[PDB]
Amino acid sequence: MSYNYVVTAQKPTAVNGCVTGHFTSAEDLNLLIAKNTRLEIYVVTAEGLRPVKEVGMYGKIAVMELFRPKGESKDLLFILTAKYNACILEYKQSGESIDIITRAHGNVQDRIGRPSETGIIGIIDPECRMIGLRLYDGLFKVIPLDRDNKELKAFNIRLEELHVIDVKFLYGCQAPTICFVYQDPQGRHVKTYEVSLREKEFNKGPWKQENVEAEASMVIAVPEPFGGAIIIGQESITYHNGDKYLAIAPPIIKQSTIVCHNRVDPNGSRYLLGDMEGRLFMLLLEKEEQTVTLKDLRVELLGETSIAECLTYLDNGVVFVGSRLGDSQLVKLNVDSNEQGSYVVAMETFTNLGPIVDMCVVDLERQGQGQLVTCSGAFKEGSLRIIRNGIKLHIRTVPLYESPRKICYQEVSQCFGVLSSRIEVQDGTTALRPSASTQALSSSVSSSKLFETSFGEEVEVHNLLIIDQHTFEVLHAHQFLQNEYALSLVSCKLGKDPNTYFIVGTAMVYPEEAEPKQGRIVVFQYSDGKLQTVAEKEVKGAVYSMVEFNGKLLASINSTVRLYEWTTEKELRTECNHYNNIMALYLKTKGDFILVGDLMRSVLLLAYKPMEGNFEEIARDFNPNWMSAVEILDDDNFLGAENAFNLFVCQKDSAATTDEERQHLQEVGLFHLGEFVNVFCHGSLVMQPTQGSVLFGTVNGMIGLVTSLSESWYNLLLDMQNRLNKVIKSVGKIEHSFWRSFHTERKTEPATGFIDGDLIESFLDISRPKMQEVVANLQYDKREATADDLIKVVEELTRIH
Amino acid sequence: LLFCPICGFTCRQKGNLLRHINLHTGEKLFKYHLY
Amino acid sequence: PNIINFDTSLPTSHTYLGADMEEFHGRTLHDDDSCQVIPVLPQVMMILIPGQTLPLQLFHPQEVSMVRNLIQKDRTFAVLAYSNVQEREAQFGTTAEIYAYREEQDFGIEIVKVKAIGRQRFKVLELRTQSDGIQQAKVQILPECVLPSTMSAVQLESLNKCQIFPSKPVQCSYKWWQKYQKRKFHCANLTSWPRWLYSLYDAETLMDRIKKQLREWDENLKDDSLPSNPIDFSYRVAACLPIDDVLRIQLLKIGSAIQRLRCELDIMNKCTSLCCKQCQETEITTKNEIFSLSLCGPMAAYVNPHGYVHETLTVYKACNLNLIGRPSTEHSWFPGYAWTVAQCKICASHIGWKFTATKKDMSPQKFWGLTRSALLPTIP
Numbered sequence A: 001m002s003y004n005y006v007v008t009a010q011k012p013t014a015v016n017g018c019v020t021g022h023f024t025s026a027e028d029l030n031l032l033i034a035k036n037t038r039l040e041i042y043v044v045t046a047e048g049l050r051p052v053k054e055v056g057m058y059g060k061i062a063v064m065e066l067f068r069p070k071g072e073s074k075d076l077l078f079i080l081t082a083k084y085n086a087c088i089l090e091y092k093q094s095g096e097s098i099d100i101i102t103r104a105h106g107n108v109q110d111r112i113g114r115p116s117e118t119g120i121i122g123i124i125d126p127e128c129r130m131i132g133l134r135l136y137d138g139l140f141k142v143i144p145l146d147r148d149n150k151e152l153k154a155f156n157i158r159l160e161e162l163h164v165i166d167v168k169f170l171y172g173c174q175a176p177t178i179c180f181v182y183q184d185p186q187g188r189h190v191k192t193y194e195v196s197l198r199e200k201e202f203n204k205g206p207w208k209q210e211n212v213e214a215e216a217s218m219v220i221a222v223p224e225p226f227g228g229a230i231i232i233g234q235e236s237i238t239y240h241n242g243d244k245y246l247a248i249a250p251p252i253i254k255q256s257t258i259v260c261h262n263r264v265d266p267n268g269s270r271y272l273l274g275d276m277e278g279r280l281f282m283l284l285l286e287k288e289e290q291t292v293t294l295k296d297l298r299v300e301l302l303g304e305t306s307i308a309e310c311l312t313y314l315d316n317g318v319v320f321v322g323s324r325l326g327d328s329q330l331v332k333l334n335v336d337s338n339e340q341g342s343y344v345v346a347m348e349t350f351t352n353l354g355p356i357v358d359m360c361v362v363d364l365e366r367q368g369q370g371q372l373v374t375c376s377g378a379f380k381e382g383s384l385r386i387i388r389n390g391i392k393l394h395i396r397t398v399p400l401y402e403s404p405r406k407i408c409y410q411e412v413s414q415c416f417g418v419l420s421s422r423i424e425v426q427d428g429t430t431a432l433r434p435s436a437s438t439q440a441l442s443s444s445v446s447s448s449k450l451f452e453t454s455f456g457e458e459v460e461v462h463n464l465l466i467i468d469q470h471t472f473e474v475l476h477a478h479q480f481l482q483n484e485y486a487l488s489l490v491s492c493k494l495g496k497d498p499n500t501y502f503i504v505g506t507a508m509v510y511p512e513e514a515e516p517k518q519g520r521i522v523v524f525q526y527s528d529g530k531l532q533t534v535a536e537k538e539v540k541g542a543v544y545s546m547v548e549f550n551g552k553l554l555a556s557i558n559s560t561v562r563l564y565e566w567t568t569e570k571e572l573r574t575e576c577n578h579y580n581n582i583m584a585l586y587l588k589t590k591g592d593f594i595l596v597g598d599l600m601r602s603v604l605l606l607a608y609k610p611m612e613g614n615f616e617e618i619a620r621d622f623n624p625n626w627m628s629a630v631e632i633l634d635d636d637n638f639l640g641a642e643n644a645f646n647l648f649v650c651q652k653d654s655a656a657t658t659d660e661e662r663q664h665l666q667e668v669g670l671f672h673l674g675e676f677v678n679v680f681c682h683g684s685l686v687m688q689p690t691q692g693s694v695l696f697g698t699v700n701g702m703i704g705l706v707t708s709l710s711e712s713w714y715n716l717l718l719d720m721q722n723r724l725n726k727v728i729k730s731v732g733k734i735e736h737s738f739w740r741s742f743h744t745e746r747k748t749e750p751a752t753g754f755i756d757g758d759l760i761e762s763f764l765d766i767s768r769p770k771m772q773e774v775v776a777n778l779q780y781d782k783r784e785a786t787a788d789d790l791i792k793v794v795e796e797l798t799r800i801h
Numbered sequence B: 001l002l003f004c005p006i007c008g009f010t011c012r013q014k015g016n017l018l019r020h021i022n023l024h025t026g027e028k029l030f031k032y033h034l035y
Numbered sequence C: 001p002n003i004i005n006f007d008t009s010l011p012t013s014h015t016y017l018g019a020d021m022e023e024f025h026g027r028t029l030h031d032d033d034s035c036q037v038i039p040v041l042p043q044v045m046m047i048l049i050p051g052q053t054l055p056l057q058l059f060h061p062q063e064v065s066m067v068r069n070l071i072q073k074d075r076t077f078a079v080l081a082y083s084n085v086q087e088r089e090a091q092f093g094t095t096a097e098i099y100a101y102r103e104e105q106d107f108g109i110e111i112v113k114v115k116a117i118g119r120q121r122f123k124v125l126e127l128r129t130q131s132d133g134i135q136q137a138k139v140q141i142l143p144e145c146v147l148p149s150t151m152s153a154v155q156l157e158s159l160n161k162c163q164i165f166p167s168k169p170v171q172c173s174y175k176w177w178q179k180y181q182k183r184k185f186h187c188a189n190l191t192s193w194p195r196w197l198y199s200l201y202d203a204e205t206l207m208d209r210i211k212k213q214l215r216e217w218d219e220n221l222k223d224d225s226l227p228s229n230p231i232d233f234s235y236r237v238a239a240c241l242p243i244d245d246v247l248r249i250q251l252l253k254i255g256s257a258i259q260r261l262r263c264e265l266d267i268m269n270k271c272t273s274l275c276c277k278q279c280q281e282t283e284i285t286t287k288n289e290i291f292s293l294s295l296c297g298p299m300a301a302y303v304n305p306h307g308y309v310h311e312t313l314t315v316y317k318a319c320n321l322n323l324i325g326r327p328s329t330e331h332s333w334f335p336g337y338a339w340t341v342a343q344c345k346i347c348a349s350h351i352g353w354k355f356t357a358t359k360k361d362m363s364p365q366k367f368w369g370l371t372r373s374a375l376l377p378t379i380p
């Protein structure tokens, strides 16, 4: 009963996987990068990366491995998607035509099983005898890598260790041995098994079971002639091989967890390691011949990069650093350190807009074309991103070196108000690095009468930053009270006051209290380059959200919705209250309607009654599920994002006979987006068929657009989707309907009420014979639809973003 | 001597027994309970 | 509130009912939303929470025959959650699986003693009377909505490894929970909400807070004595809370363990006093007096010699109670203790009993058991 259209204005930019090998040809050195649903294949050259291809997958790439079974001249690519679609693909080039062949594919889902705590694990035997998957606790799935197994038919082997933390395939074994670190009440142990395909079962591992560090997390399968494995934990790096045992406890790696690694040398003599704070180390394996055996382990701090999700060493000291929290990097490892003792020098930076935690659409140049200003990144990678359509999407970066959380725009003062957070070590606290909040032109610290420790303890300092819209310099930085957490920010006029204010909601958060018991609503005015605290109100809870409601202020305090009026004395006077029994995390408004939402999808819809001066529960829809954002498309339709990365639409249908149906929001649209939407925002990026425009920003840095379609256009485009799915060859042979089906966990239903804009737009990139196949016996305005009419329709659709 | 089927109330005369038993706020399903 | 030398496992056995009874271990469950038809006992009227034990005595021949039939087949009947006791409203109910049965011919009449256990909540689709006087009801088996972790969707693949914490140590708790929050909800920086906000919806954190608030009721409350599953823990807490019937109905309606735990924490933090139902101002006790003398928590259901079911809450102190009778060990619900009738001082209505230890070496020497149906919660 709803008709919506979703397009990707910006493709996902966060990197969640990178591999190196020989995929395009036996001689080329290829780098493969996974950006959620995109796969980018580059050829590594002395001049950097040469993009060879980019492919769209109908899934979230969770596993991506390259292997070369005996008889193959190039590497084959094994990919598993978050919905458990497995595929072995090959790279075929005919003249100038590039196409990723699908050598084999299947779905390795099990109808039963709890998804593992540590997520999906996918490994391949060094001899390419099989693929080992860890998807559910207590089971180990084996896919024999026999060329006859074109359906990727796997079998399970029971694991006696339910809490497996990591697992790898060992080198130099006559049988496909696995070494894995797991946990039990007695601590963490490294254990080895010997997989048998003939018997489809485990066998006693080569060496033995052994006890490891309490925080052992990472397993590295060292190649020949070393063999064995390296276990990396919080404080120690150990090497186990048969009876041989080695250990080191370097103090450099003790201030951050090592999360990613990569083998530098083919013989395993060098490894790259990366911590959670952007430090890049080198691990060196000193070998001595007696047969070659390991002599010692040494760790060196190569330098500092962007906070790395994955690392891969390409060649000639060049390393690609794929990051989720910041721009990906191409850096070079120098032989000798520079003046600051860093061996790492950045060569290239690849843009990454994710995570987008908030954004606002503003017409800075006032040409009638909006620009999207987003709070992207986290920690030292935090920044503002100004995105505008070019004459294809020009992006400007404003580094902040601290996490930006909320953003709003003030036309009168020509500035943005940005809530930001910086981590400070409780030394009495000191900043880790210079950041926007500390280097502001002028600054102030909250001073309100209202309201243990350790050296290594970390605390969050929250600031309101006034940033010029032209130079994007930090004009002002106001620091909030200690332990105060700034949650909401609006800029608006109130009452008869002709001034425009920045209004901030904050909660007093202490580690002792489970939920905040007191909080603040602060009203600042930015005038003549000064930020003055015009008013201050104490409330008994956390002000989770705030909105200007028809000249008044509508705030959400814990589980209450409070409407304040702005009296002549410039103070907030409570006009009315409403109690919902749910924490009003999301608070949207349209006209006199208020949408109140909870983290568990408990949606309700209130209406303000001016004559009665009170709220009334117009409608309600409670359904246990995690919810990340909501928006009001129009008076009736409400759009939200929920678990398993899917959009949903709820409809009120006030013209219902029975009062039960008048108080129910029937879900009228579901669509597996594949992205975790963080923020919704009404606006458009094109100069001002479809109605409305709601941009949304997600965790992977993707920006999408949702608009409303008429029933006729929705039916036509649904028909077009059905036509195309039979014509377009999906990579990995994943069905589009399965990809876009609502997912959750073991509970999937087909998507409805949503037109996949990307699939429609792909109609323009197919050969004319394919277009003719797609357009056949179709009805267009009835009449006999022709290829050119659909080309015109798709071209019109492409202009909304 | 008189017992209350609901609680262990004990009393001598009968009027108080009926008063208390009726005081019990409940459907007092005497049909399904008393021996 | 002396140290409990008492074997808290005693009352849960319902030794007062009689000697050993035919115990059935044949657990029976119906698939989610599976439509079923089940019988009903008109005698029972209590709100049964799944996992809570309901003891009963039946003397009427119709009920005896019905339970005899139930022993064959599944041994599962229904308990209607009467929103309004009159006219048997019964918009929701709970399946009770009979797990103990005994038969006796004392008094010259056939008598059957039963112990059932709540198994599954359900919605009543159709309630119809049979020719034998045993109502048979249509049952839509409500499901247990199990949600994944809040950060399961937003979780960096690199940090997925190391998500398993080492263990809990046998200030230390505060530091461990700070570390747990910091590590579990790190990827909360990828979203628009803080870590503590996600902690407010974390199953483990909510159970820990509930345990912290329960420990005041039992100093010997070893963790193993409380369920570790969020669903079982939530149902146990809901069964042990001294709340009115409307709140019990509300807790039964909720299908998600997270929501049940949040509502339970709200109720615990709000309710303060326990007052007389037949009055409106005579406060019989306060939450601070609630203490657990059983493995089932402070509040549990027992039967009298005439089959009436009382949900008694055990406390170490009561006020405004007029005592009647003499300490009688007969049919005492707490072995080694003698009971006496207790009435409200103002309206002289039955509120509960006072129990006194029969041995001088037994602690606590005295305490009280107040019937839930004879009390109402009072907020300040």
Ligand SMILES: O=C1CC[C@H](N2C(=O)c3ccc(N4CCOCC4)cc3C2=O)C(=O)N1
Residues within 6 Å of the ligand: B003, B004, B005, B006, B007, B008, B009, C303, C304, C305, C330, C331, C332, C333, C334, C339, C353
């Ligand atoms: O803990 C306890 C205390 C109360 C409870 N109870 C009753 O409500 C009750 C009512 C009448 C009773 N009589 C039946 C006839 O001859 C003696 C008096 C006995 C009880 C009794 O034990 C119980 O069974 N166990």
Ligand SMILES: [Zn+2]
Residues within 6 Å of the ligand: B004, B005, B006, B007, B008, B009, B020, B021, B024, C350
């Ligand atoms: Zn009585």
Ligand SMILES: [Zn+2]
Residues within 6 Å of the ligand: C276, C277, C278, C279, C280, C282, C344, C345, C346, C347, C348, C349
């Ligand atoms: Zn009274």
